[PDB]
Scaffold this active site. Structure first.
Site, PDB file in Angstrom:
ATOM      1  N   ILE A  13      81.782  83.074 125.868  1.00 30.83           N
ATOM      2  CA  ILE A  13      81.837  81.840 125.042  1.00 30.83           C
ATOM      3  C   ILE A  13      80.833  81.782 123.846  1.00 30.83           C
ATOM      4  O   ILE A  13      81.287  81.777 122.700  1.00 30.83           O
ATOM      5  CB  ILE A  13      81.672  80.571 125.943  1.00 30.83           C
ATOM      6  CG1 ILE A  13      82.673  80.562 127.143  1.00 30.83           C
ATOM      7  CG2 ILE A  13      81.775  79.264 125.126  1.00 30.83           C
ATOM      8  CD1 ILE A  13      84.167  80.493 126.790  1.00 30.83           C
ATOM      9  N   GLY A  14      79.518  81.714 124.119  1.00 29.79           N
ATOM     10  CA  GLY A  14      78.469  81.492 123.107  1.00 29.79           C
ATOM     11  C   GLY A  14      77.215  82.328 123.315  1.00 29.79           C
ATOM     12  O   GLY A  14      77.172  83.132 124.247  1.00 29.79           O
ATOM     13  N   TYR A  18      67.142  84.161 123.055  1.00 31.63           N
ATOM     14  CA  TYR A  18      66.539  84.385 124.384  1.00 31.63           C
ATOM     15  C   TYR A  18      67.468  84.011 125.556  1.00 31.63           C
ATOM     16  O   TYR A  18      67.027  83.981 126.711  1.00 31.63           O
ATOM     17  CB  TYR A  18      65.176  83.679 124.498  1.00 31.63           C
ATOM     18  CG  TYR A  18      65.201  82.179 124.334  1.00 31.63           C
ATOM     19  CD1 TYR A  18      65.375  81.342 125.429  1.00 31.63           C
ATOM     20  CD2 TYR A  18      64.978  81.591 123.096  1.00 31.63           C
ATOM     21  CE1 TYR A  18      65.360  79.958 125.290  1.00 31.63           C
ATOM     22  CE2 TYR A  18      64.969  80.208 122.942  1.00 31.63           C
ATOM     23  CZ  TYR A  18      65.167  79.392 124.042  1.00 31.63           C
ATOM     24  OH  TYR A  18      65.169  78.020 123.923  1.00 31.63           O
ATOM     25  N   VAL A  21      75.404  81.629 126.673  1.00 34.94           N
ATOM     26  CA  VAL A  21      76.257  80.638 127.368  1.00 34.94           C
ATOM     27  C   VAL A  21      77.671  81.199 127.534  1.00 34.94           C
ATOM     28  O   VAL A  21      78.241  81.669 126.561  1.00 34.94           O
ATOM     29  CB  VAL A  21      76.323  79.258 126.644  1.00 34.94           C
ATOM     30  CG1 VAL A  21      77.030  78.199 127.502  1.00 34.94           C
ATOM     31  CG2 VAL A  21      74.952  78.757 126.182  1.00 34.94           C
ATOM     32  N   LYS A  36      74.882  78.936 131.221  1.00 32.56           N
ATOM     33  CA  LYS A  36      74.085  79.721 130.306  1.00 32.56           C
ATOM     34  C   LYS A  36      72.923  80.461 130.956  1.00 32.56           C
ATOM     35  O   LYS A  36      72.015  79.859 131.518  1.00 32.56           O
ATOM     36  CB  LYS A  36      73.609  78.874 129.109  1.00 32.56           C
ATOM     37  CG  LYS A  36      72.493  77.869 129.298  1.00 32.56           C
ATOM     38  CD  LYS A  36      72.373  77.012 128.032  1.00 32.56           C
ATOM     39  CE  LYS A  36      71.138  76.145 127.986  1.00 32.56           C
ATOM     40  NZ  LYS A  36      70.038  76.783 127.210  1.00 32.56           N
ATOM     41  N   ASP A 131      67.525  69.956 115.429  1.00 31.49           N
ATOM     42  CA  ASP A 131      68.421  71.049 115.086  1.00 31.49           C
ATOM     43  C   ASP A 131      69.900  70.625 115.226  1.00 31.49           C
ATOM     44  O   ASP A 131      70.710  71.374 115.739  1.00 31.49           O
ATOM     45  CB  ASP A 131      68.095  72.268 115.913  1.00 31.49           C
ATOM     46  CG  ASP A 131      68.745  73.556 115.433  1.00 31.49           C
ATOM     47  OD1 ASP A 131      68.964  73.701 114.177  1.00 31.49           O
ATOM     48  OD2 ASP A 131      69.038  74.411 116.286  1.00 31.49           O
TER      49      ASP A 131
END
Ligand code: KE8
Length: 332
Positions: A13-14, A18, A21, A36, A131
């Site tokens: 997925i992502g 560091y 996910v 994750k 963010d």
């Protein structure tokens, strides 16, 4: 991906610097979930950010903020190499969505509402996300929106917000308020509002509004649309390097929002203008943005909750705090 018998049948997925996910199937409840894999135990900063996020997401409960359902880890500090954070699986994110889909005005309105509703709660906790960006806004198949990724979040500190000109900054460049580059450490709530302003602009066109390619090009993108700051707004920058940099630039005129966004609702552009104000003192706040005419179909302050308990604020001590902070999910 070492996630035990609860989490069968995995996917892809992502990602992060560091950690990473991905997706799997849950058995205690009977649904697919997101998981994750975080492995931060080599760097102090990444331990600090794994810890920031865990502490915040565990304290927070809100429909437009991602929760933690489970945390999977070894039973002892010694045996603990990775931390697996389990969350509700969300069909997509606004980044992926904006690269493939035109958003109707009705979707834009609803997304902006949910972002601000989530952000009202965050800010009421004295927390700054720092963010916000399309890829940190998750969406399910019915367009419910949750804010994720609190690894750069901080307790607000407006009395320590000042810094010099060209101070390095960590959060994603395209969503950085102009004051970051000029005189701000990003310790005030106004920093998040600017990001939301950018996200709104991007929902209107499917294109980032200020796609700077390096630190200072970011500011010059901003000034190319907003125009040169006024005398009053310039007088609020007391730092001489920063002030004199702005004074050295050629005069630029404001690009009207309706030339940039000719299909946009006129109330959405009025709110945009107030989110993308150069002077962070004059910038609209979250509860005033929720109260703006554009959002009137949704606005209900009794249904926009606030936090009960706001916040006040090496690598070996942080692993132990990460170990202690994830203890509640362990068997026994
Ligand atoms: C299918 N789909 N498509 C898009 C999003 C999704 N579903 C989905 N459902 C639930 C949660 C999430 C995410 C959580 C986080 C995500 S997605 C990112 C943004 C990767 N992130 C930061 C990771 N850190 C960065 C710094 O190093 C350490 C790791 C999270 O915490 N996603």
């Amino acid at each position: 991906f070492d996630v035990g018998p609860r989490y069968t049948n995995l996917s892809y997925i992502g990602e992060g610097a560091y950690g990473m996910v991905c997706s799997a199937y849950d058995n205690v409840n009977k649904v697919r979930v997101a998981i994750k894999k975080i492995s931060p135990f080599e760097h102090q900063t990444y331990c600090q950010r794994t810890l920031r996020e865990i502490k915040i997401l565990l304290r927070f409960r809100h429909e437009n903020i991602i929760g933690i359902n489970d945390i999977i880890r070894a039973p002892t500090i010694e045996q603990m190499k990775d931390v697996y954070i389990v969350q509700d699986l969300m069909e997509t994110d606004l980044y992926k969505l904006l690269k493939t889909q035109h958003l109707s005005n009705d979707h834009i309105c609803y997304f902006l509402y949910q972002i601000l509703r989530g952000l009202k709660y965050i800010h009421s906790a004295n927390v700054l996300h720092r963010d916000l960006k399309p890829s940190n806004l998750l969406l399910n198949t019915t367009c419910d929106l949750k804010i994720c990724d609190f690894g750069l979040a901080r307790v607000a500190d407006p009395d320590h917000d000042h810094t010099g000109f060209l101070t390095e900054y960590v959060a994603t460049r395209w969503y950085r308020a102009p004051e970051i580059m000029l005189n701000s450490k990003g310790y005030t709530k106004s920093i998040d509002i600017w990001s939301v302003g950018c996200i709104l602009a991007e929902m209107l066109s499917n294109r980032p509004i200020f796609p700077g390619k390096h630190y200072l090009d970011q500011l010059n993108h901003i000034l190319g649309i907003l125009g040169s700051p006024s005398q009053e707004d310039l007088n609020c920058i007391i730092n001489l390097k920063a002030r004199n940099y702005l004074l050295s630039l050629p005069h630029k005129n404001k690009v009207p929002w309706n030339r940039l966004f000719p299909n946009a609702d006129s109330k959405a552009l009025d709110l945009l203008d107030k989110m993308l104000t150069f002077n962070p003192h004059k910038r609209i706040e979250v509860e005033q943005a929720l109260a703006h005419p554009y959002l009137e179909q949704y606005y209900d302050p009794s249904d926009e909750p606030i936090a009960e308990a706001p916040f006040k604020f090496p690598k070996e001590k942080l692993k132990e705090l990460i170990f202690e902070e994830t203890a509640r999910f362990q068997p026994g």
